[PDB]
Short mmCIF file of C-alpha atoms in Angstrom, two decimals:
data_model
loop_
_atom_site.label_atom_id
_atom_site.label_comp_id
_atom_site.label_asym_id
_atom_site.label_seq_id
_atom_site.Cartn_x
_atom_site.Cartn_y
_atom_site.Cartn_z
CA UNK A 1 112.61 94.69 92.07
CA UNK A 2 111.77 95.46 95.71
CA UNK A 3 113.29 94.07 98.87
CA UNK A 4 110.74 92.04 100.84
CA UNK A 5 110.85 94.65 103.60
CA UNK A 6 110.20 97.53 101.21
CA UNK A 7 107.33 95.66 99.58
CA UNK A 8 105.75 95.22 103.01
CA UNK A 9 106.07 98.94 103.65
CA UNK A 10 104.53 99.84 100.27
CA UNK A 11 101.63 97.41 100.67
CA UNK A 12 100.85 97.70 104.34
CA UNK A 13 102.08 100.87 106.03
CA UNK A 14 100.03 104.05 106.30
CA UNK A 15 101.27 106.10 109.25
CA UNK A 16 99.97 109.37 107.74
CA UNK A 17 96.45 108.93 109.10
CA UNK A 18 95.01 107.53 112.33
CA UNK A 19 92.28 105.64 110.41
CA UNK A 20 90.72 105.43 106.94
CA UNK A 21 89.54 108.92 106.01
CA UNK A 22 86.51 107.95 103.89
CA UNK A 23 84.74 105.08 102.16
CA UNK A 24 86.96 105.85 99.18
CA UNK A 25 90.17 105.31 101.17
CA UNK A 26 90.84 101.85 99.72
CA UNK A 27 90.13 102.89 96.14
CA UNK A 28 92.66 105.68 96.53
CA UNK A 29 95.30 103.72 98.43
CA UNK A 30 95.21 100.57 96.32
CA UNK A 31 95.85 102.70 93.27
CA UNK A 32 98.58 104.95 94.69
CA UNK A 33 100.46 102.05 96.31
CA UNK A 34 100.54 100.41 92.87
CA UNK A 35 98.40 97.43 93.80
CA UNK A 36 96.10 97.76 90.76
CA UNK A 37 98.75 97.87 88.01
CA UNK A 38 98.86 94.31 86.62
CA UNK A 39 95.72 93.03 88.36
CA UNK A 40 93.40 94.15 91.14
CA UNK A 41 95.07 92.83 94.28
CA UNK A 42 92.03 91.10 95.79
CA UNK A 43 92.70 91.75 99.50
CA UNK A 44 95.11 94.10 101.29
CA UNK A 45 95.43 95.54 104.79
CA UNK A 46 96.89 98.95 105.73
CA UNK A 47 98.24 99.63 109.23
CA UNK A 48 97.85 103.08 110.77
CA UNK A 49 100.59 102.98 113.35
CA UNK A 50 104.18 104.17 113.20
CA UNK A 51 106.66 102.11 111.19
CA UNK A 52 108.58 101.63 114.45
CA UNK A 53 105.51 100.15 116.18
CA UNK A 54 104.88 97.74 113.29
CA UNK A 55 108.52 96.66 113.08
CA UNK A 56 108.39 96.09 116.83
CA UNK A 57 105.88 93.29 116.26
CA UNK A 58 108.80 91.09 115.15
CA UNK A 59 109.90 91.02 118.79
CA UNK A 60 106.42 90.27 120.17
CA UNK A 61 104.30 87.09 120.30
CA UNK A 62 105.74 84.28 118.17
CA UNK A 63 102.84 82.36 116.52
CA UNK A 64 102.34 80.12 113.48
CA UNK A 65 101.57 81.67 110.09
CA UNK A 66 98.47 80.42 108.22
CA UNK A 67 100.72 78.33 105.98
CA UNK A 68 102.50 76.67 108.89
CA UNK A 69 105.72 78.71 108.85
CA UNK A 70 107.12 79.53 112.31
CA UNK A 71 108.34 83.10 111.74
CA UNK A 72 105.05 84.90 112.38
CA UNK A 73 104.41 87.35 115.21
CA UNK A 74 101.24 88.73 116.75
CA UNK A 75 101.13 92.26 118.14
CA UNK A 76 100.57 92.40 121.88
CA UNK A 77 98.25 95.37 121.47
CA UNK A 78 95.54 96.17 118.94
CA UNK A 79 96.39 98.52 116.09
CA UNK A 80 94.36 100.79 113.84
CA UNK A 81 94.01 99.06 110.49
CA UNK A 82 92.04 99.23 107.28
CA UNK A 83 91.00 96.15 105.34
CA UNK A 84 90.65 96.67 101.56
CA UNK A 85 88.77 94.02 99.55
CA UNK A 86 87.53 93.94 95.97
CA UNK A 87 83.77 94.29 95.84
CA UNK A 88 80.75 95.13 93.71
CA UNK A 89 81.69 95.26 90.05
CA UNK A 90 85.46 95.35 90.48
CA UNK A 91 87.07 94.12 87.29
CA UNK A 92 90.57 94.88 86.00
CA UNK A 93 91.42 97.50 84.99
CA UNK A 94 88.44 99.00 86.82
CA UNK A 95 89.24 97.93 90.37
CA UNK A 96 86.77 98.75 93.15
CA UNK A 97 87.34 98.23 96.87
CA UNK A 98 85.40 98.05 100.10
CA UNK A 99 87.02 99.92 103.00
CA UNK A 100 86.63 98.40 106.46
CA UNK A 101 88.26 100.16 109.43
CA UNK A 102 89.05 98.20 112.56
CA UNK A 103 91.20 97.92 115.65
CA UNK A 104 92.84 94.52 115.81
CA UNK A 105 96.03 92.65 116.60
CA UNK A 106 98.18 92.17 113.52
CA UNK A 107 100.13 89.05 112.56
CA UNK A 108 103.19 89.47 110.36
CA UNK A 109 105.96 87.22 109.09
CA UNK A 110 109.44 88.53 109.82
CA UNK A 111 112.79 87.95 108.11
CA UNK A 112 116.31 89.30 107.83
CA UNK A 113 118.82 91.39 109.73
CA UNK A 114 117.38 93.69 110.86
CA UNK A 115 114.47 91.35 111.58
CA UNK A 116 111.54 93.18 110.01
CA UNK A 117 108.06 92.39 108.62
CA UNK A 118 107.97 90.87 105.12
CA UNK A 119 104.38 89.64 104.86
CA UNK A 120 101.01 90.53 106.40
CA UNK A 121 99.37 87.27 107.51
CA UNK A 122 96.16 88.23 109.28
CA UNK A 123 94.59 90.42 111.89
CA UNK A 124 92.81 89.33 115.04
CA UNK B 1 85.31 61.90 103.85
CA UNK B 2 83.42 65.06 104.82
CA UNK B 3 81.29 67.34 102.70
CA UNK B 4 82.84 70.80 102.41
CA UNK B 5 79.92 72.23 104.39
CA UNK B 6 80.32 69.72 107.21
CA UNK B 7 84.05 70.33 107.37
CA UNK B 8 83.35 74.06 107.79
CA UNK B 9 80.97 73.30 110.63
CA UNK B 10 83.48 71.01 112.37
CA UNK B 11 86.35 73.48 112.02
CA UNK B 12 84.63 76.79 112.57
CA UNK B 13 81.31 76.62 114.40
CA UNK B 14 80.97 76.88 118.17
CA UNK B 15 77.47 78.08 119.04
CA UNK B 16 77.61 76.49 122.51
CA UNK B 17 79.37 79.46 124.11
CA UNK B 18 79.16 83.23 123.66
CA UNK B 19 82.98 83.55 123.74
CA UNK B 20 86.11 81.52 124.59
CA UNK B 21 85.72 80.28 128.16
CA UNK B 22 89.40 80.30 129.17
CA UNK B 23 92.96 80.61 127.90
CA UNK B 24 92.81 76.85 127.37
CA UNK B 25 89.81 77.09 125.02
CA UNK B 26 91.88 76.61 121.85
CA UNK B 27 93.88 73.71 123.24
CA UNK B 28 90.63 71.96 124.08
CA UNK B 29 88.75 72.83 120.89
CA UNK B 30 91.55 72.08 118.44
CA UNK B 31 91.83 68.63 119.94
CA UNK B 32 88.12 67.80 120.17
CA UNK B 33 87.36 69.08 116.66
CA UNK B 34 90.06 66.71 115.40
CA UNK B 35 92.40 69.41 114.14
CA UNK B 36 95.49 67.93 115.84
CA UNK B 37 95.26 64.35 114.51
CA UNK B 38 97.71 64.22 111.58
CA UNK B 39 99.42 67.57 112.26
CA UNK B 40 98.82 70.64 114.39
CA UNK B 41 96.57 72.80 112.25
CA UNK B 42 98.56 76.04 112.50
CA UNK B 43 95.68 78.56 112.51
CA UNK B 44 91.92 78.15 113.00
CA UNK B 45 89.01 80.44 113.86
CA UNK B 46 85.85 79.48 115.79
CA UNK B 47 82.63 81.48 115.45
CA UNK B 48 80.34 81.90 118.45
CA UNK B 49 77.10 82.71 116.71
CA UNK B 50 74.23 80.49 115.65
CA UNK B 51 74.74 78.26 112.61
CA UNK B 52 71.84 80.14 111.00
CA UNK B 53 73.61 83.50 111.47
CA UNK B 54 76.84 82.16 109.96
CA UNK B 55 75.08 80.53 107.01
CA UNK B 56 73.31 83.85 106.47
CA UNK B 57 76.65 85.45 105.63
CA UNK B 58 76.42 83.77 102.20
CA UNK B 59 73.64 86.25 101.38
CA UNK B 60 75.53 89.30 102.70
CA UNK B 61 78.41 91.39 101.29
CA UNK B 62 80.04 89.79 98.24
CA UNK B 63 83.83 90.42 98.38
CA UNK B 64 86.99 88.84 96.95
CA UNK B 65 88.67 85.97 98.79
CA UNK B 66 92.40 86.32 99.60
CA UNK B 67 93.21 84.01 96.68
CA UNK B 68 91.18 86.03 94.19
CA UNK B 69 88.07 83.82 94.04
CA UNK B 70 84.78 85.73 93.78
CA UNK B 71 82.56 83.60 96.04
CA UNK B 72 83.50 85.18 99.36
CA UNK B 73 81.11 87.08 101.63
CA UNK B 74 81.66 89.47 104.51
CA UNK B 75 79.23 89.60 107.43
CA UNK B 76 77.39 92.91 107.71
CA UNK B 77 77.72 92.80 111.49
CA UNK B 78 80.57 91.81 113.79
CA UNK B 79 80.49 88.35 115.34
CA UNK B 80 82.01 86.81 118.45
CA UNK B 81 84.99 84.74 117.35
CA UNK B 82 88.05 83.02 118.74
CA UNK B 83 91.34 82.86 116.88
CA UNK B 84 93.48 79.77 117.65
CA UNK B 85 97.15 79.83 116.62
CA UNK B 86 100.06 77.52 117.39
CA UNK B 87 102.45 79.14 119.83
CA UNK B 88 105.25 78.61 122.32
CA UNK B 89 106.65 75.11 122.03
CA UNK B 90 103.87 73.60 119.94
CA UNK B 91 105.22 70.57 118.13
CA UNK B 92 103.27 67.59 116.80
CA UNK B 93 102.01 65.55 118.51
CA UNK B 94 102.22 68.05 121.37
CA UNK B 95 100.18 70.89 119.90
CA UNK B 96 99.83 74.13 121.88
CA UNK B 97 97.58 77.06 120.99
CA UNK B 98 97.11 80.71 121.82
CA UNK B 99 93.47 81.74 122.32
CA UNK B 100 92.50 85.23 121.17
CA UNK B 101 88.87 86.34 121.58
CA UNK B 102 87.51 89.12 119.40
CA UNK B 103 84.46 90.69 117.83
CA UNK B 104 84.94 91.05 114.09
CA UNK B 105 83.29 90.70 110.71
CA UNK B 106 83.86 87.28 109.20
CA UNK B 107 84.63 86.47 105.57
CA UNK B 108 83.65 83.06 104.25
CA UNK B 109 83.64 81.35 100.87
CA UNK B 110 80.28 79.86 99.93
CA UNK B 111 79.32 77.00 97.61
CA UNK B 112 76.49 74.65 96.73
CA UNK B 113 72.73 74.36 96.94
CA UNK B 114 71.92 75.30 99.60
CA UNK B 115 74.58 78.01 99.32
CA UNK B 116 76.53 77.59 102.55
CA UNK B 117 80.00 78.38 103.93
CA UNK B 118 82.80 76.01 102.87
CA UNK B 119 85.92 77.92 103.92
CA UNK B 120 86.85 80.55 106.51
CA UNK B 121 88.87 83.24 104.73
CA UNK B 122 89.53 85.96 107.28
CA UNK B 123 88.01 88.21 109.87
CA UNK B 124 87.93 91.98 109.88
#
């Protein structure tokens, strides 16, 4: 079992590239980050900034999460991100994803000591 | 009680302006669209395009919703939107919102005949 922080890293962090490298980026990343094992994870965002910069969001703008929790934080600056969403004829175990690159603020829920991201809520 | 389509219009449509008019836009709009009556709605997005253009998204890119439903659609083009999120010392009945303007693709769930938006899923 993963810690919540490590799960966030596995699902949402890609500091190895400044942006999605091709239209196949999501197909590749959803598979290699183990998000297509038991089901096709329907929606998932990757962040192309340093882990330090993403962790730093937990000390930025405190805002509500979509579910009403009060431990969400919005990045002061925009960040390079990639949205991955099931599309076309995606059907487990043949998952297929649309890759959409953007530059947006991210909103994450933070927990723990150290206080780090544990859930990706949205991007603006 | 509202139809799902009318609720979407009340919560998410603002064709009267090309973008949020001030930092107080969300405070004003969340109140006047009756989203602060029983609770402070934590998060809500307004779309500044014509109703026709937003309805048209139901005939655009079919993608998964965050919850795994298959009736979501992503706009081919970006749209002017405003994200409203509770912030600071927001506490019912004294709701307070952060206003964040952006240009992004929208993702909506569609239902019915006519097939129209009934839920705002996310923006990319």
